[PDB]
Amino acid sequence: IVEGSDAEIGMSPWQVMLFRKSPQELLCGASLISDRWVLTAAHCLLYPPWDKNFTENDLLVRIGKHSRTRYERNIEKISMLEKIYIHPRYNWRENLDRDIALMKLKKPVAFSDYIHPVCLPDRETAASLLQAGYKGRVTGWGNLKEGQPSVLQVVNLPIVERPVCKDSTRIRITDNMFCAGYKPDEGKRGDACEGDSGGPFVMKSPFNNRWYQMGIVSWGEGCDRDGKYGFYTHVFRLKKWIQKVIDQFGE
Amino acid sequence: ADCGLRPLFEKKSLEDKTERELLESYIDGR
Ligand SMILES: *[C@@H]1O[C@H](CO)[C@@H](O)[C@H](O)[C@H]1NC(C)=O
Ligand SMILES: [Cl-]
Ligand code: NA
């Protein structure tokens, strides 16, 4: 996270770290959506141009964390993956369209003060909240500049008008993505950066005071560049697929 | 059923240091 600040303890209890087993390293962010399902970006698991194609036993998730590096014995939970599900129409060859994946854990995780699931938006919540100028929140342990934080970082960023998103890049964007970040004329900064991808873009609903995950950190051209924006997988647009997977393979 | 309500914040009637920025964007952002 560029131009963010340290998270408070328990501020983002749905935050998940996707971790490579061997060698040991932070790969991506992710989020807890129930006691045995975790949401992330497809590109965190599968990106053939870089010979990335993880199997379940290659990875673990760490939940309840604050420190990037310390083993937090009394608060974090480390879980194994039972199965990875990648959207079948994930378009890594062109534009990272439908950049979404689910991971089912080998056993349910116990919730605590530090571990708690985020909500996924319904249609009306998405229609009401995903509007240009309204702000959401991105969290992660990714780099501080395009350089690693000691603890989880947070930044709030405004959703950007689709024509501005489109004009900012030559990538073919789709309705399964949205972009967020400040414009140059707003004179404020902030972005996701390397290591934050797969993590959540959340919004606090004014209707019921609950946090909803509206986006998944997907891609950007550099980090925090003027006239560039972060791109996020549109969670509501993909919710039909999320529901299909969880209904078929079991809550 | 309990999703999105944080044990250390909403459940204790405590606000985090920047969530007001989000709420205020609903007033001023459009
Ligand atoms: C990824 O690896 C799995 C497990 O070996 C393999 O079966 C699958 O074909 C691979 N997928 C791609 C797109 O390379
Ligand atoms: Cl300007
Ligand atoms: Na920018």
Residue numbers in the entry:
A (entry chain H): 321 to 466, 475 to 579
B (entry chain L): 291 to 320
From the paper:
Prevention of pathological clot formation can be achieved by specifically inhibiting the serine proteinase α-thrombin, an enzyme that occupies a central role in the blood coagulation cascade, where it plays both pro and anticoagulant roles. In an attempt to discover new anticoagulants with lower risk of bleeding, a new generation of peptidic DTI derived from the d-Phe-Pro-d-Arg tripeptide scaffold was developed. The three-dimensional structures of three complexes of human α-thrombin with peptide inhibitors (general sequence d-Phe-Pro-d-Arg-P1′-CONH2 with l-isoleucine (fPrI), l-cysteine (fPrC) or d-threonine (fPrt) at the P1′ position) were determined by X-ray crystallography. The structure of the proteinase in all the complexes is very similar to that of the unliganded enzyme (248 Cα atoms of the heavy chain of thrombin can be aligned with a r.m.s.d. of 0.22, 0.17 and 0.12 Å for fPrI, fPrC and fPrt, respectively), with minor changes mostly in the side chain conformation of specific residues.
The structural model of unliganded human α-thrombin here reported is strikingly similar to those of the proteinase in complex with small molecule inhibitors, with minor deviations in surface residues. Superposition of the heavy chain residues of unliganded α-thrombin with the equivalent residues of the thrombin∶PPACK complex results in a r.m.s.d. of 0.39 Å for 248 aligned Cα atoms. Notably, the loops surrounding the active site preserve closely the conformation observed in the thrombin∶PPACK complex, except for loop 147 which is disordered in our model. There are also no evident distortions induced by crystal packing.
